[PDB]
Structure 1
Amino acid sequence: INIQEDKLVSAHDAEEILRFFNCHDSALQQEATTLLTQEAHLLDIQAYRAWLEHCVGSEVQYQVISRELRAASERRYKLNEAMNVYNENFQQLKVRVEHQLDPQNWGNSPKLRFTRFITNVQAAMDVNDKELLHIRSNVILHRARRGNQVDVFYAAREDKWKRGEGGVRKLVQRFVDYPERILQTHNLMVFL
C-alpha cells in the first residue's frame, strides 16, 4: 500500500496491514482464534475476575478512543484528535471489575446478558520481540437488559499478547478506535 496513491488510507492502517501480509503462520492464527474465543466466553458469562487472572497481563494498556470528526483535507488544526473512552492499566481494569461485581451496583439487577461474536482473526509475531504476538480481530457485542434494552457494539481490535505467568498468553495491549462518533448504546460500559 502506497498511501500517496491510496488517498483514503492512514499511515497507521497501512503499517498494520504490512504486519500480516508477510509471514503467514496458520498455526498461529489458530492459537489466536482459541485465545480470543476463550476470552470472549469468560467475558460473556461475566467471569470478570477470571478474565483478569487468565487473559490480562500486569503491564496491560486497554484503550478505546473516540476520534473527533475533521475535514479530510484538514492540515492546520492540530489540537487533541481523540479522547480516551478507556485508557486503563491493570489496576484501573480491576476497579472496573470490582464495580461490576459490587452487590450495590443496582444496574446489574436483573443480570445483564452478553453475547460476543469474534471474527476476522489475524496473527503475527513481532519482528523484534520474538515473544510479542500481534492479534487483530473484529467484535460484534450484543448487550441485553431489562426486558427491551438492546445495544449492539461493533469494533476492530488491535491487540498485543505476551506469555506471562505459567506460560499463559495474556493481553498486554488492546487498541480500539471506536467507529461511531456519537454512541447510540446509552454508554460504552462493555469490555470490547
Structure 2
Amino acid sequence: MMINTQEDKLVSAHDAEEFHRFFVGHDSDLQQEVTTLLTREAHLLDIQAYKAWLEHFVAPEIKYQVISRELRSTSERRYQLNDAVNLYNENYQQLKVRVEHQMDPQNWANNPKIRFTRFVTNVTAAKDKSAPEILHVRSNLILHRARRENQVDVFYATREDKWKRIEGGGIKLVERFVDYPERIPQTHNLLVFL
C-alpha cells in the first residue's frame, strides 16, 4: 500500500516511503522478536543500567540523534538555512561520556535516585532489503521521569532505529533518530535516553 503525495498534501515524500517500507516489510516472527528486544532495552534503561545498555545494546558505530526542528511555513521554500538542531548527535565515545556522568557519585542531580518508567508501543519492523542483518525499527515511547517529590516530566517520541544482528545472536543499535515533536519541551531538560 502506497500514499499518493500529490493528493495527500500533508505527507512528506520521506514519510510516505517509510510508511510503504514498514507496510510491505511486515513479518510476524520479526514483530515478536523486535517487541521483545525493545521491551528488554526499555527495562534496562528504566533500572538505570546504562553501562549494560551501552555495552550490550549499542553498536560501536552508533549514531544516536535527537533533533529539534525549527517551525517553518509550509509555503516558505526560499529560506534554506539548517532547520534542525541536534539535541543529541552522539557516537559511542560521546555516549560513554554521558553514561560516566550518569553514574558518577558526584552527579548531584541523581541524588536522591530518579525514577524512570518507559512505555513502548506501536512497534513495527522491517528487514533491510540490501543488508539483511539490518533491521529497521519504528516504535513510539512515553517516558515518565519523577524526582524530588513533585517533579514529573513526560516525554513523547517516535524512535526511528536501525539495529544490527551480531555473531552469537545479539542485536545492537546502530542508529536511533528522533524528530522530537515538541519544539520547546516544558520538561526542564531532555536529559533522558529516548
Say yes or no: TM over 0.5.
Answer: yes
Q: 1:23 to 1:165 in 2, by over 3 A?
A: closer
Amino acid at match of 2:162: K
Give 1:15's aligned residue.
17
Aligned: 1:57 with 2:73: no
Alignment of 1:93-108 (within 5 A): 93-108=95-110
1:109 aligns with 111
2:39 pairs with 1:37? yes
| Residue 146 of structure 2, aligned match among 130, 137, 144 | 144
SS at match of 1:166: coil
Q: Which whole-Å deviations, capped at 9, do the CAs of 1:93-117 have from their partners, x for residues lacking one?
A: 0100000001100000000000000
| CA distance in 2 between partners of 1:128 and 1:165 (Å) | 18
Aligned length: 192
Q: Hey, what's the Cα distance between the residues in 2 that align with 1:23 and 1:155?
A: 22
What stretches of structure 2 of length at least 5 have no aligned partner?
A: none
Q: How does 1:113-192 map to 2 (within 5 A)?
A: 113-164=115-166, 166-192=168-194
> C-alpha separation between the residues in 1 aligned to 2:56 and 2:36?
13
Conservation of the 8 A alpha-carbon contact between 1:161 and 1:173: yes
4+ long deviations beyond 6 Å: none
Contact kept? 1:116, 1:140, Cα under 8 Å? yes
TM-score norm. by structure 2 comes to: 0.97
Amino acid at match of 2:65: Q
Deviates more, 1:28-37 or 1:161-170: 161-170
- Larger CA deviation: 28-37 vs 10-19: 10-19
1:47 is aligned to: 49
Q: In the alignment, is the contact (CA less than 8 A) between 2:25 and 2:125 conserved in 1?
A: no
- State the match for 1:89 in structure 2: 91
One-letter amino acid of the counterpart of residue 182, structure 1: I
Deviation of the 1:187 alpha carbon? 0.3
Displacement after TM superposition at 1:183 (Å): 1.1
Whole-angstrom distance in 1 between the partners of 2:83 and 2:5:
20
Equivalent residue letter for 1:133: L
Matched, 1:4 2:6: yes
What is the DSSP-based 3-state SS (H/G/I as helix, E as strand, rest coil) of the residue aligned with 1:77?
Answer: coil
RMSD over equivalenced CA pairs, Å: 0.8
Please report the TM-score for the alignment, with normalisation by the length of structure 1: 0.98
Is 1:3–1:14's contact at 8 Å kept on the other side of the alignment? yes
Deviation at 1:165, TM superposition (A): 5.3
| C-alpha distance after superposition, 1:154-177 (max 9, x if no partner) | 000100000235331000000000
Distance 1:23 1:13 in 2: 15
Identical amino acids, percent of aligned pairs: 78
Whichever residue aligns with residue 9 of structure 2, its letter is K
Partner amino acid for 2:158? A
